[PDB]
């Protein structure tokens, strides 16, 4: 009985070592491990016969549905195409913004202006919008 218990403890200790090197010392991008809310900082304390972990997670609420586009292009010049970085292009519903499209973050709804910091240049695709006037990245 003791030999079996000792071996299972050694295997469990190997799992603890892996969690300290992926959840305690770094931010995890894997999901699975930890509470299911992506992952931010985790902590370790000593327990009887082992380690006790605490994982702070980020949990969503109050979801809404919005209209979004795959990407945007210049209607006058097909090589000028952009796609959002770490976020989405959404139809504007905010009274501060005077543009048809707006940028929002992936994990939190908040409209912002579309600028060069929020985007990347891509090859054109048939699903991208054909914008006839106001685009600031690229201005042309």
């Amino acid at each position, epitope marked *: 009985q003791q030999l079996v218990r000792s071996e299972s403890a050694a295997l469990s200790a190997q799992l603890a070592k892996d969690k300290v090197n992926e959840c305690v010392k770094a931010q995890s991008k894997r999901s699975g491990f930890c509470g299911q809310g992506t992952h931010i900082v985790s902590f370790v304390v000593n327990a009887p016969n082992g380690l006790y972990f605490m994982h702070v997670g980020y949990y969503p609420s109050n979801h809404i549905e919005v*209209v979004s586009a795959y990407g945007l292009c210049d209607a006058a010049n097909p090589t000028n195409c952009i796609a959002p970085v770490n976020g989405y292009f959404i*139809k*504007t*519903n*905010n*009274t*501060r*913004i*005077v*543009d048809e499209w707006s940028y929002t973050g992936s994990s939190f709804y908040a409209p912002e*202006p579309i600028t060069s910091l929020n985007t990347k240049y891509v090859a054109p695709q048939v699903t991208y919008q054909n914008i*006839s*006037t*106001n685009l600031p990245p690229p201005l042309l």
Partner: antibody
Amino acid sequence: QVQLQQSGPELVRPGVSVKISCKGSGYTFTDYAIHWVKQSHAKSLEWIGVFSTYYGNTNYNQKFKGRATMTVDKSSSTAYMELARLTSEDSAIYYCARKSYYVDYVDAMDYWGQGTSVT
Amino acid sequence: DIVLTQSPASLAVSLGQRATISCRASESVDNYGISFMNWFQQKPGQPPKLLISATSNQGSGVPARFIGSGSGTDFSLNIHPVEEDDTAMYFCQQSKEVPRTFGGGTKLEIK
């Protein structure tokens, strides 16, 4: 208690660059863009432009794009429209109006300023 | 820009009568099912006033008396109990595309 206090009317002579002001009151001025409109007749009105009061970004009607420009005085909660090179065809009633979204993704002109005129 | 036109140029109805206004667009203004059609009201001595918007027949500053309808290129306003304080110019407004132009409008009258 929303107000849009336009500056008073004037018979301005041609060739002047004419500035008109509109003062917001009773609400947070920086959260709403201001639309500007020209009325030459009871049945002839046209959009002039829109001014973001947070970011300063603008759009203009193409016919006035090289004539009309818009600016802000955030400390006085006021927006201005200045129209270069006045001519007799600009004699009109001018308005300012608050942007809104009563319906999702549909621009509305909400509360309007009382009207001013230039001639 | 898409051109908006409206008919009849003026309409006279008796007090308490239903009345309608027809509105026509040169190209359809539906994009993503949104419609983007607003109706406005003006009297002499006044600014234009927002009445309704595409999904808001009640709300947007009015009672359910102002019924917007239609889709594509054809829109209408329908008011079932007209009174003399509804006599005003009425306009179709496009919110879909720049530079946001709008119709010449029609005049409601009383018989």
